[PDB]
């Protein structure tokens, strides 16, 4: 079966260091606590609100070990007044036989508020 | 196999209460079509035209029986000039054994001119 | 297995008749290089930089041979300062055997600088 693997955080500045570091961060995160293995990875959509135009997030990918052929794109997450502001978010998919309500989804820094 | 089902709806305000209402009765809609059960979903993308920042329309996947470990995330739909206006749309994948030809994909509201 | 296909292609002016042009274009080099046959794609997402208004870049899909029951969905990408601009991408999903490492993703026009 086919699982999607949620995942979010938040920067403080608009700065390539910043967006790439957290980024990376929470890519290690989900990776570690769902034991993901680049070969059994569909696809990854990474998503930023409106506030960040520094980076594209996905340059972190580049960083990881084996994660050269996984197909990843970036699109901008809706703006709604009063959201989690400066955020980056992402949608995995991945294959597992792990139960739906027994995947590790990742929320680190200022997104802890969607837990 | 895995399919991916798409709907589409329309509001006539940008309110918390109507874009709730709405993406509730889009995504009952689906699951009525499709015979959806929660733990065959892999994902769900939703979607709303740069016009509605009231709330994320993924609030409404609350009201729904057994979706909490569903992962889902909202992105903004491309703005084009003279497309649909105050739209929300869904990518729901699934796994099913129904064809291509024979998935009930949805469209209600004024997105019924997408049909 | 699913995987996803990734593609992506630049246009000189925002007209529906270029945007159309090369969306389709791009496509159609997809489904060369992979060897794509419609009831195996899962479903597809379509995004555009903030630069183009003209057309939905799926209105081109409709010019394919039986590809008429395939889920697309357009969202538009992240505005990053200083990124690829007047920008379509593709992210496919389908079903193949083809491993990770030997899947075709193509870059055509100014998108080859992403190659």
Same mark, same amino acid.
């Given at each position: 079966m086919i699982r999607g693997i949620r995942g979010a955080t938040t920067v =403080?500045?608009?700065?390539?260091?910043?967006?790439?570091?957290?980024?990376?961060?929470l890519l290690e995160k989900i990776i570690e606590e769902n034991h993901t293995? $680049?070969?059994? *990875?569909?696809?990854?959509?990474?998503?930023?609100? $409106?506030?960040?135009?520094a980076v594209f997030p996905a340059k972190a990918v580049r960083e990881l070990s084996g994660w050269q052929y996984v197909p990843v794109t970036c699109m901008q997450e809706m703006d709604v007044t009063g959201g989690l502001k400066k955020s980056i978010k992402v949608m995995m998919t991945v294959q597992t036989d792990v139960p739906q309500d027994q995947?590790?989804? *990742?929320?680190? =820094?200022?997104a802890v508020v969607l837990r």
């Open positions: =403080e500045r608009d700065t390539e260091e910043e967006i790439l570091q957290k980024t990376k961060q293995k $680049p070969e059994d *990875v569909v696809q990854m959509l990474l998503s930023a609100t $409106p506030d960040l135009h995947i590790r989804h *990742v929320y680190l =820094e200022k």
